[PDB]
Symmetry: D2
Subunit: 432 residues, 4 copies
């Protein structure tokens, strides 16, 4: 039977609403887009299923989509990332949301599947909004009959984008897709500066440990690794980076970090955090070398960066929960502290990124949903990014809140550098 929503505790809605109102003031881009596109109702007729961490920030995105005319259903893309008071507030607003903090895997799948059908009539979704690819996979692999009537999808994160390029190479991408991750105002702000805000936050809330003087190994120096390393360095930690990519490794050395193999530094590390989007970064052989009370955690999208299966099989019998999402294992006499069972730690042990940086990602997300819903016929079954002018517009919408003033080119200065006075200001290859 139809289930209108499912949340941990609907009585948390009042608290969630108070925090949503504060978040709105910190998300000027989303609120400006609400205001500019509200009158036009661009998303009228859309039935968007979203699969994205059910946080206070996501609530503002959800209510922006509704404000633009859409019908929306929602689930979280991680079992530990929902903020229960945010979910309760969205449920109390009449929006079908299926999400709570601490789901098991069967519940996680069940929540996604509820979002595919709208109302008692079970009307199918016609738009996909994804973070990591699990909703995309659910529809494409388990409900392929529905794709004929879905106009397109947007994908929010690096890991889900890679899965979309797997599908292109495999001939299994059956609709247009906009890669929101690689808007400049997403990748270079959310992935990097968002993790700078929220990585140390999660370690502090989980463990309360002193960070100054601790040796922190950051595995990876992509956008998440850059921000995560900066997070700990700004708290006084001594950060060593690992990398496979010689360009990213040289960047870390130029920023004043040592860059070593994990095997070189594992036996003296105080904290190890993975940022790679790969698998098998922290293995049984590494756990066997760690010193007592080493904290191990992951801020990449999936928990398989850390071999939790090995740890639970070999040392799970004497696992002790310190408190929820802070587990202590004993490996041959040395305690190992695992945060959020190896799941993305900033959302699992804290609240993820702050509202202001998520306003950039979610402004891109909203513009992508508009573009697909209105203009999907103009696109092939390939992966696209938003045009640079829209990327620039998203950034510009956040400047007044910060007291940032921009210069204005004269027409002659603009011609001198080969641009127009209203932009775009950079060639499409520019890397910022």
């Amino acid at each position: 039977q139809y289930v209108p929503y499912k949340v941990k505790d609907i009585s948390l809605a009042e608290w969630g609403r108070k925090e949503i109102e504060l978040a709105e003031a910190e998300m000027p881009g989303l609120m400006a887009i609400r205001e500019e596109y509200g009158p036009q109702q661009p998303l009228k007729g859309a039935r968007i299923a979203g699969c994205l961490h059910m946080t206070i920030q996501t609530a503002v995105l959800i209510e922006t989509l509704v404000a633009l005319g859409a019908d929306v259903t929602w689930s979280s893309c991680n079992i530990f990332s929902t903020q229960d008071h945010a979910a309760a507030a969205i449920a109390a607003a009449g929006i079908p949301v299926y999400a709570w903090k601490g789901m098991n895997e069967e519940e996680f799948d069940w929540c996604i599947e509820q979002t595919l059908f709208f109302g008692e009539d079970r009307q199918p979704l016609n738009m996909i909004l994804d973070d990591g690819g699990d909703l995309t996979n659910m529809v494409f692999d388990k409900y392929p009959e529905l794709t004929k009537d879905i106009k397109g999808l947007s994908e929010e994160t690096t890991t889900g984008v890679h899965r979309l390029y797997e599908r292109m190479q495999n001939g299994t991408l059956v609709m247009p897709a906009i890669n929101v991750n690689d808007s400049v105002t997403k990748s270079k702000f959310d992935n990097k500066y968002g993790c700078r805000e929220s990585a140390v936050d999660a370690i502090r809330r989980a463990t309360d440990v002193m960070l100054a003087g601790k040796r922190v190994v950051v595995c990876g120096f992509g956008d998440v690794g850059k921000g995560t390393a900066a997070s700990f360095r700004g708290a006084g930690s001594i950060v060593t980076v690992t990398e496979i990519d010689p360009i990213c490794a040289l960047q870390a050395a130029m920023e004043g970090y040592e860059v070593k193999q994990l095997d070189t530094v594992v036996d003296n590390a105080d904290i190890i955090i993975t940022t790679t989007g790969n698998f098998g970064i922290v293995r049984g052989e590494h756990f066997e070398k760690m010193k007592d009370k080493t904290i191990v955690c992951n801020i990449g999208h999936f928990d398989n960066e850390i071999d939790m299966a090995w740890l639970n099989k070999n040392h799970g019998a004497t696992k002790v929960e310190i408190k929820p999402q802070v587990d202590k294992y004993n490996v041959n006499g040395n305690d190992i502290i695992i945060l959020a069972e190896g799941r993305l730690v900033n959302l699992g042990c804290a609240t993820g990124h702050p509202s202001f940086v998520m306003s950039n990602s979610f402004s891109n997300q909203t513009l992508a949903q508009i573009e697909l819903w209105v203009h999907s016929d103009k696109y092939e079954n390939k992966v696209y990014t938003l045009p640079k002018h829209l990327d620039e517009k998203v950034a510009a919408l956040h400047l007044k809140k910060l007291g940032v003033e921009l210069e204005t080119l004269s027409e002659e200065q603009a011609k001198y550098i080969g641009v127009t006075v209203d932009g775009p200001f950079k060639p499409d290859y520019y890397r910022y």
Copy 2:
């Protein structure tokens, strides 16, 4: 009638004990002092009343004093700083503790008064361990008859030390006192690096706001102000400092901060945090100038740095609690967000300093209690500090945990610079 303890929820003890065990590993100085002085039972016969934030870290101090032979009673020195699971664990260990998070002022006084008498026999305390001076004032002002049999007191923080110098000038200091605040390993580590760890932590847990690009006004640039400014700068904030002292102001300018009057910067500040130990820093006239959703908080010892009386009198009728210790007031159309009702915010909205830095303060605290209990007859009714050799010993006890190696002077190098090979290494005027 005698009350053996009073805590919020004794069933939190198991969780508290798990966190105490983790804290012990992060407090090598305290555990080393336990180990060195345990066999000697130096505190046998002592009945120490302590008045100090009832945190996990304080639990390790309490159990160190007991391990050294003392009987101990305890209360918190702030109405919001107790960690209820730490209090429960100490209560379950059989130690008289009277403390919970969120006391009112009548309860705060009642808790202190219970600590003055030991057991059903109501045996009076004979040692004072204080943080801020309220326990000292309670005994000296309200129970003066008890001071004849108290061997001495130690005082942990800058504000309580100043009160002790008031008493010296006033002829009302009636026992020897050791100033633990001004051990180098306390003032220059706890006050500064501890606030670097815990100031931003509290703002994040309370508000989840983005700190990068925010204008943060840090009022004061003493040890707490230096650490607090560093806290926000390391998170990407744009910090402006205020000061009355031209030397401290010049330090802030040399560290790359603007230094302005609060009146110059109040109307564009995103966060204002007071660190002065003074009163009347943030006044009604300042609230009237703040922009919408400015966060105002205090990390000095007492809440009177912010004129909360003015704010509650003039705008309390429409106060909204966002969540506990996060209050929203509307001042002439602009929201003002107050953290922890103006009480010390790192303990009120987070967990205070981390264990490792508190091990330095509490190692000094333990050595001071030993020195007074054993050698109080060798002291006048004046304020003293521990000798530099003990200060150096405290620092040395924390080096191995961090992987710090020290050089050893040859006898000839030691003579060259005028020291002995075992220290002390600096003249008593050295400022570090």
Copy 3:
């Protein structure tokens, strides 16, 4: 008549050679390329005219090209950037170099023109190696008859690349061109980290001023602006950034800088430095507002970022040379200090970037010259970049010198993220 070289003082060669030998040890990429391609003589038959700051670093590039088989002639692309002992050493090695520090504009052109013809026979060049486009313009505009026998050109810097895209749009690019600037290992290392090394260096050598606590306005926050801002911030300055581009402006705010219009901050600035590659950044109206003894300088390619014509016309009569390339003007009673007559200040008042970062740029430059000389027939009269594998190779060649260790993907980890174990590791759109 043929002139074999022209330098300030050939007796500086011994000193130049000693510094070249030290630079070789700091340029592992260039020396590795020498070693790998030396036996193959890939540049046999090439007659490369180079127009690029005649520094110690450029000497190692010149001798690498010769080591690979090329005949080379050389001039500097700026009137103040030659290091006379580097020029003398190259002249003493028998290489035709025409360059000294402090040329006038007629001499600058004369030096370029000598490089176009090789030996007493006046054999024409057949390869162009340019930095800024002035050599390209000299050949294309003044000696167009020579382009038929030139196989291609490489261009090293952002400003010259823009000129190449002007030529493409104008139908005046008559040979293949490789954009070396936008190798990742050039733009994201030289432009950014190189200016971090050398911007403050130049201000210190020129003026010896205290940088801590000074208000520095960095105009622009592209790669040069990012590095320049970091240069001054790391010295304790209080940096404000200006920008036209909302994405770059938001980056600066997220990095903890205020971002304002120059007009907002000009009257209180202590140092103003331009990084834009535009013109007309610092105008007469700005000079009229500056406070006494403000230092004004430019680190973009051309001096027209600052309106030096206005300053010399209106206030040149009382100009005082403090020392060479440090000039003091009096504007309505306030002194203005101009560095290097507004020409790129890191090369004009110091020695430009250090050897290690120039090894990255010049490794790319060498590989580009090889690719064009060997494979120019495979290219159209368009602008190209080197493939990502070569970019990665350049970075990898510099890791051992720094003690950087790289992880190696398993074949299964490589397939998981969609790469091969030997790279390239990132999609072509990746921005680092």
Copy 4:
């Protein structure tokens, strides 16, 4: 016969004067003291011999003393620290100065001895102004007959202060002495922030090496070590600190540096710089372990921190001068680069600290000379410091130049914290 001055080249005076005028604008404290005390001629009758690095900054000090009524003679306290154009300008002003860059030791002593007698009449000095103790030792040890008529001495640096405490313990301090080093506005600004400005400066001018990613070993973490470590960290270097003092070592770990024995890190260091004021820090056994082209230098007062005797005895025969004060030795196949022959490197290879920070030290120096000349009868043959009010006054005189605004206490706020509204604001034990 009497010699009126001795400098390298008097024709450098015009250049020196231009730079002195710029320095005056950067030394508001000295110029304010000139202005306040000029009318009173407090130093009338004084004959001050100064022995202090003959830099542009020292020229402003010299001319301030003359402006206050004193007769002055001067020499430099280091063989490499004189700025010849500063010396020429002072000589051209009619002031007896005996100093040039690159003296030998016999010349160094000869210069000091000329300063002891004034004019053709050979009138003896009656005031000593010293930096390091060599002038003090010259008078006390070689001209003891003169001390009866010298009213007192001031001493500027940590090393000379220690020598004064040696003399107190030895009963050989025969006049009052003011320790200028340990004014707060000297030790905590000059020693620390001055070296932050000038340590990296010297390495860049001498070697032009890339600092990002280099491993720099800073020996010592006193005030000079703190500033020197910050210098290199702000340039992107990876700094490891060495220490004998557990408090200073813990400070470095809390600031995010590794802290190791030199023996642990010597074989992989790129730069080693000594800051201890001790001897025998870098020994033959260390040189034998260094890798090729390691840069070794010293920023403590005396060159014996590095065993230059060992290096010259064992490897001097193949020493190569790269350029003046940059020497290359070959130790068993590895090149070692020595800066300034091991003498204080910021003055030997660059220009020492900038004017603004020296204005703080030299404002203290001027007030100390006034206090001794006027009030020496009120002092014993002991070491004294200036009162805190004068320390605060010195800092306050530099605030307007930086745009620093100070708050003003109300009388009630002042009483609350136990001070007066005009200061002093801190107890005498305060460490800042």
